[PDB]
Design a protein around this ligand. Structure first.
Ligand SMILES: Nc1ncc(Cl)c(C(=O)N[C@@H]2c3ccccc3-c3c(-c4nc5cnccc5[nH]4)cccc32)n1
Length: 208
């Protein structure tokens, strides 16, 4: 039941830029994914102020960071708003295109790759460290889906039959072979303290 989609040219070019450009400050991917999780948590929390039933799918608002050395993955889990199928295929494609255009204009002018989140496409900083990204997500208005891409111009979307999430998003980073430092407890703790110390939700760094 896996559907395959083509990225539009602008976001495909940004993915190639992120993968190919020499840029040593890769650690900022984690700040960007935590910021996305914080934004998604703010969104469901604000909606719950008008409709408390929005939290029937889970009252806890949190972010978990889960390293797995055997699988070579780093997972960022949140209980935020999640994404519907229409967000995954259509709405976020619209954001990816306009944000990429603005970011590329800013880069040619002299901006740095670390400013990617100002353009609403900080998610794509995952490709600084991951060869493949898998997004498992559950929004209140839709079913659980898995979006995935290893770049190369395409992504896939399928209904996910994995462990039911309640609500939120898991960003699974299948790390590149030379980026295993992001599985180490001391490294993750250092990065969260440097860039994400004031996020308004509990961030639990899991260990093995
Ligand atoms: N924790 C959490 N909770 C909610 C969201 Cl909304 C996100 C997030 O960062 N979503 C990402 C995002 C951002 C910007 C542009 C595209 C995308 C995107 C996409 C996406 N990029 C696309 C590019 N072209 C077509 C369809 C696309 N769909 C897919 C999955 C996840 C994200 N993260």
């Amino acid at each position: 039941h896996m559907e395959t989609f083509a990225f539009q040219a602008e976001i495909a070019q940004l993915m190639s830029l992120i993968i190919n450009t020499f840029y040593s400050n890769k650690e900022i991917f984690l700040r960007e994914l935590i910021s996305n999780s914080s934004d998604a948590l703010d969104k469901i929390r604000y909606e719950s102020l008008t409709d408390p039933s929005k939290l029937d799918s889970g009252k806890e608002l949190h972010i978990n960071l889960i390293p797995n050395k055997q699988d070579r993955t780093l997972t960022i889990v949140d209980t935020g708003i999640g994404m519907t199928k229409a967000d995954l295929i259509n709405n976020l494609g619209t954001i990816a295109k306009s944000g990429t255009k603005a970011f590329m204009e800013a880069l040619q002018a002299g901006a740095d790759i670390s400013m990617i989140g100002q353009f609403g496409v900080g998610f794509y900083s995952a490709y600084l460290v991951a060869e493949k990204v898998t997004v498992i997500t559950k929004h209140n208005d839709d079913e659980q889906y898995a979006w995935e891409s290893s770049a190369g111009g395409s992504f896939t979307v399928r209904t996910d039959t994995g462990e039911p999430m309640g609500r939120g998003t898991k960003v699974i980073l299948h790390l590149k072979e030379d980026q295993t430092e992001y599985l180490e407890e001391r490294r993750i703790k250092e990065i969260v303290k440097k860039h994400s110390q004031f996020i308004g939700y509990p961030i639990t760094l899991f260990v093995e």
